[PDB]
């Protein structure tokens, strides 16, 4: 007789604990950090780390809790560790934009292939991607009076011209702007090929010095959630 009462009390306690934990589970937002090797993924986290087999990082922005999960120690050409990440809010992609000359095949081509594989994955059909184009000043140094040229490694650069809607940063030559926008459009072509209106991409330009990486991620996550809510009610 008393066994039923004891089980009922235990069930009530467990239900209370689960109800308490549900709020904190729903409050936080989860992000995934994926990058190819030599990317800078490590440097970016510590600056974010300096401010407020697996790695977890906690940081709060405007009373909103974000949690970031580097997956590491498992280098796989084929990834089966990606079916578990279909509920994340956004995916942060880091690519070394200055390494088009470095030969392993090319590193930039390998990064493009990885991005194409990620974009078309079956379980990530409704996951947006935030793109960080690292190593800006190395690319500037290579482009400005450099023996190596993009023409040799990437032939279709020759037919590429600067977009009319571009907004080049002050004090830079047109050549570095052309290279940066060519790489960004090369990524955006794959982004657009099969967008289907369910998930987008947010390209960005950064360097070791920049400390705004925290504000950008927050704005992109807010935009992603707002766009998803807008699309849910058939308003976009």
């Amino acid at each position: 007789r008393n066994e039923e009462k004891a089980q009922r009390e235990a069930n009530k306690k467990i239900e209370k604990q689960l109800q308490k934990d549900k709020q904190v589970y729903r409050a936080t937002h989860r992000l995934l950090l994926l990058g190819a090797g030599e990317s800078g993924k490590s440097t970016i986290v510590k600056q974010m780390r300096i401010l407020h087999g697996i790695f977890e990082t906690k940081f709060q922005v405007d009373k909103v809790n974000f949690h970031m999960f580097d997956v590491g120690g498992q280098r796989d050409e084929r990834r089966k560790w990606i079916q578990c990440f279909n509920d994340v809010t956004a995916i942060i992609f880091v690519v070394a934009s200055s390494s088009y000359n470095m030969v392993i095949t090319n590193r930039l081509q390998e990064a493009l292939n990885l991005f194409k594989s990620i974009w078309n994955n079956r379980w990530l059909r409704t996951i947006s991607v935030i793109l960080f184009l690292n190593k800006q000043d190395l690319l500037a140094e290579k482009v400005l009076a450099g023996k190596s040229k993009i023409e040799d490694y990437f032939p279709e650069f020759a037919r590429y011209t600067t977009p009319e809607d571009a907004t080049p940063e002050p004090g830079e030559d047109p050549r570095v702007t052309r290279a940066k926008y060519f790489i960004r459009d090369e990524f955006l072509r794959i982004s657009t090929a099969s967008g289907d209106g369910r998930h987008y991409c947010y390209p960005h330009f950064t360097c070791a010095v920049d400390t705004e990486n925290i504000r950008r991620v927050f704005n992109d996550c807010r935009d992603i959630i707002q766009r998803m809510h807008l699309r849910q009610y058939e308003l976009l």
Binding site: A10, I14, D21, Y25, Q74, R78, K80, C84, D87
Partner: protein
């Protein structure tokens, strides 16, 4: 000289294939043709368990056919009571990613692992962490309690190991696979176990000897789940090409294949019944199917889940079957 060694290996494969083909006296369907079919089978839900905040990947029935355990991605293990549909324990985790769980044969210990390369064991009656086993270089996929003082595990680094709880150091390490290993099953007498890797190959191991005995390469894609026949002389596998094949230890080749032209989804779980007549397999089409072992004829469908099925188990007494899905719900069928 490497090409000459490759030539020698190529020659051996042909001899093994010829030896396997020489034993194909008659097909299984030809032998089993005069048996009356079991007819249509129907099952209805009896219990529904709620309380998991996220998707479920694994579950394991208890040895008394009363208790069961389940692990979800919210970072919690919950031990249920199917008779009274109420919970007994709720163990939080250090890491929120878990891919497997197991229940001790004596009902004393519970183990679980995830993306972090650590297998943790909890003492139910003392609920705190008891031992942490580390040394794998890849994510764990499945683990089974061979006894109360030793466990066998498989990871994503193309290896399987047999741990020692008291010492915490590896005892025997099995190597030979090429791709990731996702599942394993043990014989009733705990002398041999089988594993299914991602290179479309299944192997038979020896626990005591620590060496491989046989190799089966029937499938053509990734192998996700594996089950073992109650008799102890057969096993079944499920792959991503919507096919199930029943192999044989004594014959050393497959005997029957289960497939249909209206399904193009994957397979995530495979299990038998007490008598072995029924084959239960979960699919990616949000439901489950019940095959016939000796006829390859469909006999029933288990529907009711709003998302894909990622778990399956049958009690020791064979009185009910429980399924897990990404809809964060567990169901009992009878």
């Amino acid at each position: 000289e490497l090409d000459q060694l490759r030539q020698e290996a190529e020659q051996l494969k042909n001899q093994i294939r010829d030896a396997r083909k020489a034993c194909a006296d008659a097909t299984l369907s030809q032998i089993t043709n005069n048996i009356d079919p079991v007819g249509r089978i129907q099952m209805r839900t009896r219990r529904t368990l709620r309380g998991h905040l996220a998707k479920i990947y694994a579950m394991h029935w208890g040895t008394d056919s009363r208790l069961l355990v389940s692990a979800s991605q919210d970072g919690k293990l919950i031990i249920w009571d199917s008779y009274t549909t109420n919970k007994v324990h709720a163990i939080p985790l250090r890491s929120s990613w878990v891919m497997t769980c197991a229940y001790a044969p004596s009902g004393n210990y519970v183990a679980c692992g995830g993306l972090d390369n650590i297998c943790s064991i909890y003492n139910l009656k003392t609920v705190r962490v008891s031992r942490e086993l580390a040394g794998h270089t890849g994510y764990l996929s499945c683990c089974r309690f061979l006894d109360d003082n030793q466990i066998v595990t498989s990871s994503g680094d193309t290896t399987c190991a047999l741990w020692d709880i008291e010492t915490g150091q590896q005892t025997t390490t099995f190597t030979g696979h090429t791709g990731d290993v996702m599942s394993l099953s043990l014989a009733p007498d705990t002398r041999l176990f089988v594993s299914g890797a991602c290179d479309a190959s299944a192997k038979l191991w020896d626990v005591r000897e620590g060496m491989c005995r046989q190799t089966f390469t029937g499938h053509e894609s990734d192998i996700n789940a594996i089950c073992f026949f109650p008799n102890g002389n057969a096993f079944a596998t499920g792959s991503d090409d919507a096919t199930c094949r029943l192999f044989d230890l004594r014959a050393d080749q497959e005997l029957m294949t289960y497939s249909h032209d209206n399904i193009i989804c994957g397979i995530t779980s495979v299990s038998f019944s007490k008598s072995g007549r029924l084959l239960l397999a979960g699919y990616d089409d949000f439901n489950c199917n019940v095959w016939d072992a000796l006829k390859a004829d469909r006999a029933g469908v288990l529907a009711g889940h709003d998302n894909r099925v990622s778990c399956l188990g049958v009690t020791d007494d064979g009185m009910a079957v429980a399924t897990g899905s990404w809809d964060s719900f567990l169901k009992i069928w009878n």
